[PDB]
Amino acid sequence: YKRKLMELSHRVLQVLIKQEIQRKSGFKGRLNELMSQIRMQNHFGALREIKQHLKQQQEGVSHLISIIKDNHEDIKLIE
Amino acid sequence: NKILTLISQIDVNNEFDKLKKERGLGNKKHRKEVSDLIKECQQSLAHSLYSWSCQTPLNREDTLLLIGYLEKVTVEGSLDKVNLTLLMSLLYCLDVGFLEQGTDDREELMKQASMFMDRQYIAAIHNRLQNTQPWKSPGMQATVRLAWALALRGISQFSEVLEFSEADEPMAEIAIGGNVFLFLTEAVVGSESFCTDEFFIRRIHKLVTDFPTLMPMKVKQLRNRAEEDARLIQMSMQMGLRRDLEHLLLLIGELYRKDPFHLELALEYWCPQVLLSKFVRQMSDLLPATLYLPYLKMLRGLASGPQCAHYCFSLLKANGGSSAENLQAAGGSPVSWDHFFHSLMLYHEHLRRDLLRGITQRELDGLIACLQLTCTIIDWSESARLALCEHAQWMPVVVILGLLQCSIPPLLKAELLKTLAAFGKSPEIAASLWQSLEYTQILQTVRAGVGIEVELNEIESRCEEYPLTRAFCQLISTLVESSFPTNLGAGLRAPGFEPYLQFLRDTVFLRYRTRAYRRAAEKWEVAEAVLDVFYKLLKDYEPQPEDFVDQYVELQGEERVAFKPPGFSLMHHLLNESPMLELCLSLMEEGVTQLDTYAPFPGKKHLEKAVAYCFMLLNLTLQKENRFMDLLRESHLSMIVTPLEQLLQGINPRSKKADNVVNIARYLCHGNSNAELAFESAK
Amino acid sequence: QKTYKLAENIDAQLKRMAQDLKEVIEHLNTSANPLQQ
C-alpha cells in the first residue's frame, strides 16, 4: 500500500502540475559508506552501581514529563 | 505375440475402471502419474518391437501376427501415436529399399534380410494382403497394399522372385482403389506424431519417392485419368468430384515440407529424377485453377532445403522470362513465375485503379497457395531470395507493396506479408524493407481513426481473430531489431517511436484481456507478440542523463520533447502502478494457476513463452534499475519511481495480499515438467 | 494550438539518504551483554 501510495502521489502531483500548465496558460560515497555501516550493524545483530542512578534519572524525567503535560493542559484550558 | 497381447490387454481405461472399482484412483497428480506410466509401458514395448524390426526383420509368423494386429487398429482420421509406430514398424519391415543402395556389402545384406531366403514369407504376406477381408481401417489396408506392391516391384528386378513380379501392379491398383493417397495424407501425416521421429519421416518419404520412381506407368495413367476427369469436370461446370491428383500433390507437398533429418529427398524431383523433373514440369502445363492451389503447396514442399529451393527458384524464374513457346498458344505453363508475377501485377493494377469484379474465391485460394510456395522457396534457398528480389520485370517487392494499400481480403494480406518476410531474410533486403515501409505508410507513422486501428477495433474484434495485429507486431519487432531510427518521422511530428508505442500498449496489450478469442490460444499469442516487442525495446535501453533532460525539437513548428532512451517510458510504466504492471502480475497469477491445473496443450507453448518474456522483462528492469535510479535521481524528473522490490511485495488484487513472490515461487514446484520457467523464476 | 532539475536531483538524493539513515537507526534498534541493553 505504501509503495502504491508513492506511485499515486507521483500521479497526483503530475496531474496537479498538468492542471497548472494547461488551464493556467494564456554524498553518494557517503551513501555507500552508510550502507556499509547499516550492513555492519546487521552483522553485529547476528555494572550494578549504575542502575541505581539510571533508575533515579528515569524517575526524575518521569516526574518532569508530568509537569510538562499539566502545563500543556492548562495552556489548553486557557485557550 | 506376448508383446502384442500385453500391449493389447493394457487398456488405460480398463485399468482406471478397475482401480476406481477398488477405489484405487489417487489425486489427478497420481492419475497422471500412473497414466503416463502405462503409456510409457505400451510405448516402450512398441519401441522394442520397432527397434527389433530395425535391427533384424521379424519372422514370417511374427510378421503375420503383426499384420493381424494392425488389421484391427483404429484411428480416432489420424492414427494414434502407438498405432502410427506399429504401422511404421511393419513399414520398415516390408521395406526393400536396401536393395537399391549401391553399397558393396549387397550379398551380406541380401542374406541378412528374411524376405530373400524364405519364399513362404512372400507367399503368405502376399496371400494375406490379397485377402479381400477389409481391414478395420481400409485406408490402412490400401496403404499396406501399395507398400507391398512397391516391395514386390523392387524385388522383381532381382531374378529370384519372378512369381510375384506381376502382382505388384494390380496391388497398387487395389491400393489406389482404397484412397491410399488420402489415407497417407490425413491419417499419418495428419497425425501430430508423424513428424516426431525422423525415421518415420524417412520411411514415409522413401515410400513417397519410390511411388513415382518404381512405377512410372501408373503415374502416367493417373495423369491421363485426371486429364479426362478435368475435361468432364469442365463439361459439368459449363453445364451448371474425384480429387486424386490434388491428393497426391498435397501429400508430396507435406511429406517433404519438413526434412527434420535434413536428408533433402526433394532433390530427387528437381533436375540440375528425370521422370521426377518431367512430372514437376508437366504438372505446370495448362494447370487449371483447381490445382493451382495444391501445386504451389507441393512446390513449397519440394523446396525443402537450400538446394531444392534453389532449383525451384530456378524453375519459376526460367518459366518467367521472355521465351518463345507453345506454337502461338494463349498461355504457357500456368505455373510459371511469368504467370505468377504477371497475374500479380494485373491484380495490383486492377485494384489500384478501382481505388465490383472482386477476386473470385478460387482465385484467392490459388493466390494464397502461390504466396505460401514462394515463401517456402525464399525461406529455404538464399539464392532463391536473391534471384526473386532482383528480377526486374517482376519487381515483386514493389508489386506487393502496391498490393498492400489495396483492399484485398485479409488472408491474402497475411500471405503477402509472409512472402515479404521470406524475402526479407537477407539483411540487404531488410534495409530497403525498413525504408520502404516507412515510405508506403502501411502503418500511419505521420498523422496529417483510419488504418490498422479501425480494422482491429471493428474487423479483428468482430471476426474474433486478430491476424492483422499479430503480423503488425511481427513487423514492428523485425524492424526494431534492425535499429529503428531515432528521428523516426522527424519533420511530420515529434521524433520518437511513441505513436506505435501507445498503439501497442494502450490499444492491444491493455485490452488483450477484453478481446474475444474464437481460438483461445489467440489471447496468449497476442500477449506474446506485444511482450516480445516491449522486451526487445527495454533490452536496449541504456539509462543516460540525456533521457531526463527534455530535449526540445522544433517539429512542425512546435517545440516537442524528444523521446528519451527507448525504454525510459516503459520503465516509467513499470516503476509505477501502471495497468501495464498489474497486467504483468495478472498474467503471472493466471499462468501460475493454469500451470497448477497440470493440463494438456491448450495454448500452452505460447503461454510458456509469454510468461517467460515477462520474467525476462522483470529481470531486465531489476538489472538496469540501479543505474536508472541513479540517473533519474541525478536529473530529477518529479516522476516518483519505486525500486521493483517494493512493488513485487505488492498486495495482489486477486490475492488481496502480497503473494506475487509466493506465486512466483510456486512455479518452482512445476520444475520437473517446466525447466524454463523454473530457471527464470530462480533468477 | 535546468536549476530546478539539479535541485530536485538533490531532492531524490536526500530522499534516498534519509531512507538510508532510517535503515541505520533500524539496524541500531536490532542491536538492542549489558552494554547493549
XYZ file of N, CA, C and O in Angstrom, chain B residues 632-638, chain C residues 4-5 8-10 12-13:
56
model
N 18.056 9.091 -12.875
C 16.856 9.869 -12.595
C 17.040 10.725 -11.353
O 16.626 11.888 -11.325
N 17.649 10.167 -10.310
C 17.945 10.948 -9.121
C 18.963 12.034 -9.423
O 19.114 12.982 -8.650
N 19.712 11.882 -10.507
C 20.659 12.923 -10.872
C 20.035 14.001 -11.753
O 20.595 15.099 -11.860
N 18.911 13.710 -12.418
C 18.344 14.683 -13.357
C 16.954 15.148 -12.932
O 16.455 16.169 -13.423
N 16.300 14.390 -12.050
C 15.255 14.894 -11.166
C 13.899 15.116 -11.799
O 13.192 16.043 -11.395
N 13.516 14.357 -12.809
C 12.100 14.307 -13.130
C 11.319 14.105 -11.837
O 11.685 13.278 -10.997
N 10.259 14.888 -11.659
C 9.467 14.736 -10.437
C 8.774 13.409 -10.376
O 8.155 13.074 -9.357
N 16.211 23.876 -11.544
C 15.195 23.059 -10.830
C 15.571 21.577 -10.943
O 15.475 20.852 -9.934
N 16.021 21.159 -12.130
C 16.420 19.746 -12.370
C 17.488 19.341 -11.346
O 17.245 18.384 -10.587
N 15.949 19.276 -7.806
C 15.167 18.087 -7.486
C 16.034 16.827 -7.543
O 15.644 15.764 -7.046
N 17.216 16.925 -8.151
C 18.149 15.808 -8.131
C 18.745 15.651 -6.750
O 18.816 14.539 -6.208
N 19.168 16.767 -6.163
C 19.458 16.777 -4.735
C 18.243 16.296 -3.945
O 18.386 15.703 -2.873
N 15.927 13.890 -4.836
C 15.954 12.431 -4.839
C 17.116 11.904 -4.003
O 16.966 10.915 -3.271
N 18.276 12.566 -4.085
C 19.439 12.126 -3.315
C 19.174 12.201 -1.816
O 19.505 11.270 -1.074
